[PDB]
Amino acid sequence: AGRKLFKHYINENIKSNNEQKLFFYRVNRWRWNTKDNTTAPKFLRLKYPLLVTGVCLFAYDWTYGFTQVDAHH
Amino acid sequence: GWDRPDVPLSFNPLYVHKRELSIFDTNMWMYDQVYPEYVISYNEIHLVDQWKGLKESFSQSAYWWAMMAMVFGFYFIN
Amino acid sequence: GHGAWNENQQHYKYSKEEIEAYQVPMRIKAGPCVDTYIPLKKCFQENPTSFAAKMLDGRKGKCAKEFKYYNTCLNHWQTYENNSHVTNAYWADTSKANADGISNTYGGSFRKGLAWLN
Amino acid sequence: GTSIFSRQFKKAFNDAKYQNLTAAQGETYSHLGWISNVDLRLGRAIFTFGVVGIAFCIYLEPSYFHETFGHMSQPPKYDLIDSNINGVEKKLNKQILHREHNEHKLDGFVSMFKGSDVAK
Amino acid sequence: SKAYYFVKNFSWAEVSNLLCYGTKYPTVLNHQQKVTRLYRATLRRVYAHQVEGYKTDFKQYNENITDIGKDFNKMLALKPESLELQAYFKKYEDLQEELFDPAMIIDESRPYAASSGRYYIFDDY
Amino acid sequence: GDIRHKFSNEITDDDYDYQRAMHVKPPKEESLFQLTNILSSVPVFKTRFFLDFIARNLDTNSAVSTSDFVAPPRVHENSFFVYHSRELGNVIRKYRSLESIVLPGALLTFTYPLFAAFVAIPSYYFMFNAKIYEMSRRFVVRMDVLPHLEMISVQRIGAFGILYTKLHRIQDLEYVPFDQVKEQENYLWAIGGHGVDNQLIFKDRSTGEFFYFERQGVWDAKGLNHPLLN
Amino acid sequence: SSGNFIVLFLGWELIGLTSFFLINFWSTRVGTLKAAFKAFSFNKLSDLFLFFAILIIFSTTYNLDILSFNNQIYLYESYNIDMFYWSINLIEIISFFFISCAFIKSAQFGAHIWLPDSMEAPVPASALIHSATLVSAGIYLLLRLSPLFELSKYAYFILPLIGSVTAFYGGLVSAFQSDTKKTLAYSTISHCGFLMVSYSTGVLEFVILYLYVHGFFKAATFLCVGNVNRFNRNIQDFKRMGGFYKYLPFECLASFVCMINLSGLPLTLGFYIKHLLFIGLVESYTLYPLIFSSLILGAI
Amino acid sequence: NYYNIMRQVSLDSNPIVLYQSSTFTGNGLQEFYENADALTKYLKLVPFFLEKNLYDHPKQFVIKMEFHPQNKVLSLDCLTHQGVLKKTVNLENLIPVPYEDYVQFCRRKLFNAPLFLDTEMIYFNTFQNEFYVFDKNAKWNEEGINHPELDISKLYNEKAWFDSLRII
Amino acid sequence: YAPQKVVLRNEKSGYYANPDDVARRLIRLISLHDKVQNPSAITLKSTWSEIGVDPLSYVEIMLEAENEFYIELADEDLERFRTVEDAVEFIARNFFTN
Ligand SMILES: CCCCCCCCCCCCCCCCCC(=O)OC[C@H](COP(=O)([O-])OCC(O)COP(=O)([O-])OC[C@@H](COC(=O)CCCCCCCCCCCCCCCCC)OC(=O)CCCCCCCCCCCCCCCCC)OC(=O)CCCCCCCCCCCCCCCCC
Ligand SMILES: CCCCCCCCCCCCCCCCCC(=O)OC[C@H](COP(=O)([O-])OCC(O)COP(=O)([O-])OC[C@@H](COC(=O)CCCCCCCCCCCCCCCCC)OC(=O)CCCCCCCCCCCCCCCCC)OC(=O)CCCCCCCCCCCCCCCCC
Ligand SMILES: CCCCCCCCCCCCCCCCCC(=O)OC[C@H](COP(=O)([O-])OCC[N+](C)(C)C)OC(=O)CCCCCCCCCCCCCCCCC
Ligand SMILES: CCCCCCCCCCCCCCCCCC(=O)OC[C@H](COP(=O)([O-])OCC[N+](C)(C)C)OC(=O)CCCCCCCCCCCCCCCCC
Ligand SMILES: CCCCCCCCCCCCCCCCCC(=O)OC[C@H](COP(=O)([O-])OCC[N+](C)(C)C)OC(=O)CCCCCCCCCCCCCCCCC
Ligand SMILES: CCCCCCCCCCCCCCCCCC(=O)OC[C@H](COP(=O)([O-])OCC[N+](C)(C)C)OC(=O)CCCCCCCCCCCCCCCCC
Ligand SMILES: CCCCCCCCCCCCCCCCCC(=O)OC[C@H](COP(=O)([O-])OCC[N+](C)(C)C)OC(=O)CCCCCCCCCCCCCCCCC
Ligand SMILES: CCCCCCCCCCCCCCCCCC(=O)OC[C@H](COP(=O)([O-])OCC[N+](C)(C)C)OC(=O)CCCCCCCCCCCCCCCCC
Ligand SMILES: CCCCCCCCCCCCCCCCCC(=O)OC[C@H](COP(=O)([O-])OCC[N+](C)(C)C)OC(=O)CCCCCCCCCCCCCCCCC
Numbered sequence A: 001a002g003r004k005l006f007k008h009y010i011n012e013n014i015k016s017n018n019e020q021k022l023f024f025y026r027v028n029r030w031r032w033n034t035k036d037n038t039t040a041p042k043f044l045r046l047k048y049p050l051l052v053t054g055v056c057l058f059a060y061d062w063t064y065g066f067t068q069v070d071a072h073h
Numbered sequence B: 001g002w003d004r005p006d007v008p009l010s011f012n013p014l015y016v017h018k019r020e021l022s023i024f025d026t027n028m029w030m031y032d033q034v035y036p037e038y039v040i041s042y043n044e045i046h047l048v049d050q051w052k053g054l055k056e057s058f059s060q061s062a063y064w065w066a067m068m069a070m071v072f073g074f075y076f077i078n
Numbered sequence C: 001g002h003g004a005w006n007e008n009q010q011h012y013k014y015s016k017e018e019i020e021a022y023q024v025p026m027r028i029k030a031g032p033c034v035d036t037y038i039p040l041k042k043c044f045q046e047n048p049t050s051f052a053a054k055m056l057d058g059r060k061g062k063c064a065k066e067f068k069y070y071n072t073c074l075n076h077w078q079t080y081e082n083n084s085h086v087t088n089a090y091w092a093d094t095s096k097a098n099a100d101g102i103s104n105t106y107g108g109s110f111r112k113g114l115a116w117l118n
Numbered sequence D: 001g002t003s004i005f006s007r008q009f010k011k012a013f014n015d016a017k018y019q020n021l022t023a024a025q026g027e028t029y030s031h032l033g034w035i036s037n038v039d040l041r042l043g044r045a046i047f048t049f050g051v052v053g054i055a056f057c058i059y060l061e062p063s064y065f066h067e068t069f070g071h072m073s074q075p076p077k078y079d080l081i082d083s084n085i086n087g088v089e090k091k092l093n094k095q096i097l098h099r100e101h102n103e104h105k106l107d108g109f110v111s112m113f114k115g116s117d118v119a120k
Numbered sequence E: 001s002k003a004y005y006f007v008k009n010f011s012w013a014e015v016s017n018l019l020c021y022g023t024k025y026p027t028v029l030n031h032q033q034k035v036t037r038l039y040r041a042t043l044r045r046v047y048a049h050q051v052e053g054y055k056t057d058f059k060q061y062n063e064n065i066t067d068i069g070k071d072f073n074k075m076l077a078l079k080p081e082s083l084e085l086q087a088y089f090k091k092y093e094d095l096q097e098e099l100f101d102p103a104m105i106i107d108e109s110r111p112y113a114a115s116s117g118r119y120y121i122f123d124d125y
Numbered sequence F: 001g002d003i004r005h006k007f008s009n010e011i012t013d014d015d016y017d018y019q020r021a022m023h024v025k026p027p028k029e030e031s032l033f034q035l036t037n038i039l040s041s042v043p044v045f046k047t048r049f050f051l052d053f054i055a056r057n058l059d060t061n062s063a064v065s066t067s068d069f070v071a072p073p074r075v076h077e078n079s080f081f082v083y084h085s086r087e088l089g090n091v092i093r094k095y096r097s098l099e100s101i102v103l104p105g106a107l108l109t110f111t112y113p114l115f116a117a118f119v120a121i122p123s124y125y126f127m128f129n130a131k132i133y134e135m136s137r138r139f140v141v142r143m144d145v146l147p148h149l150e151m152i153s154v155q156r157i158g159a160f161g162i163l164y165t166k167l168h169r170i171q172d173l174e175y176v177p178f179d180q181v182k183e184q185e186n187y188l189w190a191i192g193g194h195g196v197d198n199q200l201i202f203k204d205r206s207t208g209e210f211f212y213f214e215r216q217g218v219w220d221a222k223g224l225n226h227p228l229l230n
Numbered sequence G: 001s002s003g004n005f006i007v008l009f010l011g012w013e014l015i016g017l018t019s020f021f022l023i024n025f026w027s028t029r030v031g032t033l034k035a036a037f038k039a040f041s042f043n044k045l046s047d048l049f050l051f052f053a054i055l056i057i058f059s060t061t062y063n064l065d066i067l068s069f070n071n072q073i074y075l076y077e078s079y080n081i082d083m084f085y086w087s088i089n090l091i092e093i094i095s096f097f098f099i100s101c102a103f104i105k106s107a108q109f110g111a112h113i114w115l116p117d118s119m120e121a122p123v124p125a126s127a128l129i130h131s132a133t134l135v136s137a138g139i140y141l142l143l144r145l146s147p148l149f150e151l152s153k154y155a156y157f158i159l160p161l162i163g164s165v166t167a168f169y170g171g172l173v174s175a176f177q178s179d180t181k182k183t184l185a186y187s188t189i190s191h192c193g194f195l196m197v198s199y200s201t202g203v204l205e206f207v208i209l210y211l212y213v214h215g216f217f218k219a220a221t222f223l224c225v226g227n228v229n230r231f232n233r234n235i236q237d238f239k240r241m242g243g244f245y246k247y248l249p250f251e252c253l254a255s256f257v258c259m260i261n262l263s264g265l266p267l268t269l270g271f272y273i274k275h276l277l278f279i280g281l282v283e284s285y286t287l288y289p290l291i292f293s294s295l296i297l298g299a300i
Numbered sequence H: 001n002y003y004n005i006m007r008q009v010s011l012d013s014n015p016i017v018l019y020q021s022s023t024f025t026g027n028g029l030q031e032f033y034e035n036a037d038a039l040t041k042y043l044k045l046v047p048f049f050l051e052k053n054l055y056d057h058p059k060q061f062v063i064k065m066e067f068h069p070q071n072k073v074l075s076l077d078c079l080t081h082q083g084v085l086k087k088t089v090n091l092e093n094l095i096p097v098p099y100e101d102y103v104q105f106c107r108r109k110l111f112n113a114p115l116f117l118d119t120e121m122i123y124f125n126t127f128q129n130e131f132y133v134f135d136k137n138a139k140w141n142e143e144g145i146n147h148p149e150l151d152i153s154k155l156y157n158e159k160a161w162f163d164s165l166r167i168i
Numbered sequence I: 001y002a003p004q005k006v007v008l009r010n011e012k013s014g015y016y017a018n019p020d021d022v023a024r025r026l027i028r029l030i031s032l033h034d035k036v037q038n039p040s041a042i043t044l045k046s047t048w049s050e051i052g053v054d055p056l057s058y059v060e061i062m063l064e065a066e067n068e069f070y071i072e073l074a075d076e077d078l079e080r081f082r083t084v085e086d087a088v089e090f091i092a093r094n095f096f097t098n
């Protein structure tokens, strides 16, 4: 009954978004290239480093691991 | 790619004096022939003067005082 | 055998000249474990080893016989310095400790943190 | 004329979604197609060294874990020497060993408490 | 721009005038110059804080620049001697002051910038 | 533009293959130890036992959405739905459900529950309350309209993930511009308001309660165009 | 490696002068000269304090040998000096001058104003000065003349308070900083404060360990950020830096390791230094609440 | 601000087939099991389904796609670890995406993909926030795809295609 | 190595960057704008008003040009510019490091 509500304000928001200029989007498109950026967990891979770590720990266990004393607390 | 012209003499721009060098400002300007500068740089110029600087510093450092009080209380009751 | 934690295997007390010879750092000389420390230092000098080996060997390898006495003396020294044997008892049971006061001097001021209300 | 689901148009869009429109055609790409080989090798080597160091810290120095999370259940560790004997012999010897262990713990406690005056 | 805001003992008013408009005496400027320079300064500062900033949000940046552009179009339409235009100028000068950042990035292509005069070029004489 | 081929000792894509772990390129060949190769090679996985286990013991296709139009079950025999939240609602539900497992479990497991509570209190008051909890309290899981009452039923997530529905009169709904609340709740919108729409906030004048709608939420064209809401 | 106070003073002035030259490397610019002159003025103030302390020592004991002074100061501990209108304790005044010069050269609170401006130097010079060369001169002085400060009431009261305040201040400013070199400089200030607090605790081994860890990893991080800045064309602010992991692969991983070690983090070589500092922290201070709260904030 | 408003579409009488995978051409997961090629492709996709489930990567392997021009809706038959499912998509909600965008949408390092996963032809439903991946060994209906309703001149929107999905 | 003989500054051509590339990049940037309708009509001798760049659109285009060319343009120079010819000439002759 002539009351401003969800539909009215959704249309208002759509109009506000449409009023934006595509010039800024066009000039900045290059920034968010997926081929050029990734995440820190993806870049820092621990697969083979953990394998080398396991080798080193195994060597320690079978060389100096025997000569250790249990410390219960 | 492009054959650039030799570095411009414009890189160092000659400074031409347009104001009298007051004797009351002796050694208060770092004199130079290209980029003269004041002896002291004030980056925090949004603060008009030191007094307002003190006021702002204490008002904002109240938050750090509160943080210190809370941390000490937590360690004191534990 | 059957010696106190400060005495060494040979029950031999080193003199000032001997300490100066087998120069002992002031940190150790201040404590009571000089007698047990000197044999360990002499053993290490006779059988030098790398720092990596010292860190990775839990029994000090060759110098284990002397390190046993030194470790016992070190434990007793540090425990008596920080009074941890009484503090731990009070922490374990404050109520019983007050009931049969282990040390009223510490009991009267001890107050466990409210967060650690096990 | 062209329509979606066309392979040529799809390839063009995939290559041109993040292009640099201010550059000439054929050179309007922003991504780097590779990574410095020598730099990556050296970086991975040093990263592996650091990871190995962190793991050795975790393993041989669990003090941080003990004081941040508490002492977790320890995996079983025991010797099967007692299985050599069987019967009443085994029972009596096991009881004697248990009594000796309890007495040893008490002896350590009382010795620590008493020896406060050893150093004069 | 000479990028000498923090040098030569400028007062806060002079620094604010330099930031908003290229000149230290905006009165000499005409209406179009004032509006265009203020719009450029506002866009530059918004770009510095909401594009090249800490965890910048590009959608918020777009919305903010769109609102600023509409406001500045209205300002340009308005007459020079209008209290509404004066209010707009005061609002955006206050925004510039709010976004003022000590140690803000100064491009190396401007005078008085870091690395501006690291080398002395020898003349043909 | 590339001149690597002009030299015999220059690097090659075969030399760059090792970067595929840290660099995203379309697949070129399958290694012997890839999951796909192992599964397709080892005859054990071809067994009907393993195939049936895969078919049954995993996420079902029934729950998978099958269309871009959703008609959730009516809350009331005479009501019609307008708005519904898909993913953020489930995420909030699962987050608030932790209070039914972590909290009693923490009490019965931690050696120092008081220490845990003392750590949690300031954590809740800074960086957690405004981050998730207030947004969840004001979050609208679902919205329907009852025409006979001329009311709107709003579903919300409560403590421990409990779902409760409340009625609000259409005459008591108002639109609250984001400018009027941004300064009041800057922190809330700073760290926790990203999921919900900033410019589509409504509130009930009588009860002073806000309504946050998910950005990735489904709206009904018929519900929006119903004369009651227009 | 100075055998007497004269050689110590010579080395003091030499490091001051050479740091001035390094800061003023860009001699053509007068903006750099202002930072160089700021550092020069602070260094000259520290030289004044050190010279006056050495003069007091020479007047008391007719000797300038470091070993002789260390082994003799206890005899003269009971002495006092008659100044203008007050009878100041000799140990207290000597330790006051030494601590003043040490604070100036270690960039403690109040006297740290020159360190942020000293970043105008090229990154190698900045790393060398801020890691273990210029900012550790005060720590060296305290360690070398420890027998003096052990009998100093002023040292007991001042070292922990100023150290903790500097630690908190530097840590928070570094956290809120946006420039790489400025961040490292304020982190250096915070770690120098922590070193002062460690010396206050009084375990020289812990102080040495902290010094070594900080110096090595600060230098490494400085080198990494220098490579980053050179790639970014002398723009040291990371508001214009993004997605550099692929362009500088080695720098990314090296910086990761160096930073996790520098910033005391669990399961790293740099956790033990802070752990030992908190182990040794003393509790008899009157300002212990502020000291401990500042230390906690700086550590986090 | 883009809002997911639903239009309550329905299928038409005679659809036009646009996509038909040469493998999985049979009807039913049982037929896929009994067919040699289908079984091996299913095994190779098992990691694909694992990524769908545990890594929360919304994607679907699409086969036997049909188009309804009367209502402008695509009916997609998708293969999941459990069987074949039918889904409906509106052309207004379908946009193309690069393969790297598809990979980077997920924050977990995806398993090494098989060689029959067409990387060029990857599409994105914005309404469902989902990806559609086709099979390289497939047949495309040229006349079907050349339909007027599928033309870019009518389905093109710069803001939606280029600025809707910003993974960063 | 420099010869032992006296050598003078060699101002080869006033342009420090390829003026053709600078002009083409600037024209592409201008065409990207919404107000610009016909990229073909744009020439170096075309004024901003006739190509369709409003006074307010000009500052936006110039800010993006600064970002593209890695330089900062003073308000005085931007106001002095009257044609794409002047704009490209100034940009090309500009020493990017001042
Ligand atoms: C033996 C017993 C001995 C007892 C001794 C007691 C001694 C008491 C001394 C009190 C001294 C008061 C001095 C006031 C100076 C005002 C200067 C002024 O006019 O500035 C204008 C200026 C505003 O002008 P403006 O132009 O708008 O400013 C622009 C800014 O940008 C605008 O900034 P902004 O808006 O962005 O943010 C600013 C923000 C900054 O943020 C804050 O202020 C919040 C955090 C405040 C922390 C305060 C310190 C915490 C405690 C530390 C204690 C250390 C010593 C003790 C240690 C003991 C260890 C065991 O502040 C606010 O805006 C909030 C305003 C409310 C602040 C709280 C006011 C509390 C007053 C005291 C109430 C006491 C009630 C006692 C009831 C007892 C009942 C039995 O003021 C401010 O900005 C705010 C300054 C606030 C200072 C509060 C200081 C409180 C100190 C309490 C000490 C209590 C000790 C208790 C000991 C008990 C022992 C048993
Ligand atoms: C009789 C047969 C019995 C068979 C028993 C099999 C038991 C299998 C148990 C598996 C338990 C779960 C393992 C999970 C691994 C992934 C964890 C993860 O990433 O989560 C974090 C994840 C985020 O991490 P992200 O990096 O983003 O993940 C990306 C991908 O995961 C992509 O990840 P990524 O590729 O980046 O790295 C993931 C990697 C993680 O791997 C590691 O970290 C382990 C590193 C090695 C440790 C070795 C220790 C033992 C050996 C010590 C050294 C001995 C030296 C001896 C002397 C040597 C002398 C030279 O996964 C593995 O563990 C791979 C297996 C290790 C293969 C190589 C082992 C060494 C072989 C011998 C040396 C030769 C190596 C090759 C050649 C090298 C050059 C010459 O968080 C999540 O969201 C997890 C969500 C849940 C995902 C679950 C997916 C799997 C679901 C499986 C369901 C059950 C299926 C049952 C089928 C039964 C059929 C019958
Ligand atoms: C009751 C209140 C009494 C207050 C007494 C306060 C006395 C000390 C006041 C400070 C200045 C003292 C004179 C030295 C000025 C040096 C200027 C300079 O070098 O400029 C460089 C700098 C200016 O450079 P800048 O930091 O502005 O910018 C350069 C950096 N970039 C390039 C990044 C911009 O000067 C300063 O910043 C101030 C230096 C303060 C430290 C001065 C050390 C010597 C202290 C001598 C104390 C003498 C006390 C005598 C007895 C007093 C009795 C009351
Ligand atoms: C072209 C030549 C370029 C230069 C090549 C130089 C190569 C140097 C390689 C090793 C450097 C790094 C050593 C490890 C880091 C330090 C470790 C440490 O703190 O010491 C612990 C250990 C100390 O021993 P320890 O820690 O194992 O414990 C000793 C145990 N007790 C005490 C009981 C005896 O030191 C080392 O391991 C370092 C190596 C030994 C010292 C070598 C010094 C002489 C070098 C001879 C070669 C000279 C080449 C001249 C070339 C001239 C070219 C112009
Ligand atoms: C004289 C005694 C010498 C003792 C040497 C002790 C070395 C201790 C090393 C401690 C860890 C420090 C690592 C520093 C960096 C080097 C490691 C590294 O970069 O890892 C990343 C690298 C790669 O990191 P990535 O993950 O970036 O690489 C992925 C790409 N590809 C697949 C190409 C590798 O890790 C590995 O390559 C894993 C190696 C696992 C196996 C380790 C043992 C190798 C043994 C080789 C000799 C075998 C002799 C057999 C003789 C038989 C005779 C019959
Ligand atoms: C240019 C190249 C030069 C040569 C390159 C050489 C590479 C580095 C070689 C390092 C060899 C030594 C490794 C020691 C490993 C840690 C040992 C340990 O935890 O000490 C327990 C020892 C055993 O002590 P304890 O058991 O006698 O008593 C300790 C006392 N309480 C219980 C009170 C604590 O403990 C210590 O002495 C304290 C150690 C504190 C520091 C812990 C650091 C953990 C990280 C180790 C990183 C190792 C380097 C990186 C990986 C290298 C892999 C090859
Ligand atoms: C100074 C005073 C200090 C006071 C400190 C107080 C600390 C203790 C606080 C107690 C909190 C009690 C929380 C009750 C949670 C249920 C509330 C509720 O109604 O939610 C219903 C909710 C929602 O109910 P619903 O009706 O909406 O739907 C039913 C469930 N779904 C949604 C799935 C359909 O249901 C549940 O969450 C059921 C939880 C059942 C299990 C609860 C106990 C789990 C932990 C067991 C102990 C720890 C593990 C032990 C493992 C041993 C292995 C050997
Ligand atoms: C009694 C009133 C109700 C209290 C409810 C409990 C607090 C609120 C819910 C906490 C849920 C998170 C529990 C994480 C448990 C991790 C393992 C652990 O250390 O448990 C034993 C320990 C306690 O068991 P404890 O008391 O036997 O440990 C020995 C004592 N300490 C550790 C002090 C030496 O757990 C904790 O310390 C929890 C502290 C409270 C955390 C409050 C929320 C902040 C964290 C956000 C959630 C994610 C944390 C992830 C941590 C990962 C590892 C660093
Ligand atoms: C009340 C309980 C007793 C303790 C009293 C103290 C309460 C906690 C005080 C924490 C202050 C932390 C200040 C960090 C400032 C970082 C500034 C910075 O670098 O930029 C922001 C950086 C992010 O930088 P960025 O570059 O990613 O993005 C910045 C974005 N803008 C600029 C828009 C903000 O880091 C943060 O945002 C995190 C800090 C905010 C969240 C703080 C949560 C505090 C949780 C306290 C838990 C307490 C546990 C219980 C025990 C405590 C006592 C032992």
Ligand SMILES: CCCCCCCCCCCCCCCC(=O)OC[C@H](COP(=O)(O)O)OC(=O)CCCCCCCCCCCCCCC
Pocket: F098, F099, F103, F117, F120, F121, F123, F124, F128, F133, F137, F158, F159, F160
């Ligand atoms: C001494 C208390 C120690 C801590 C106790 C924790 C109890 C947890 C269970 C709470 C159950 C009731 C919730 C009621 C919700 C509601 O509607 O709450 C409504 C209330 C009242 O409304 P207002 O305060 O906004 O006006 O809001 C509150 O803020 C007060 C209650 C806060 C309850 C917070 C519960 C979450 C705690 C999270 C801790 C940090 C994270 C831990 C890891 C995940």
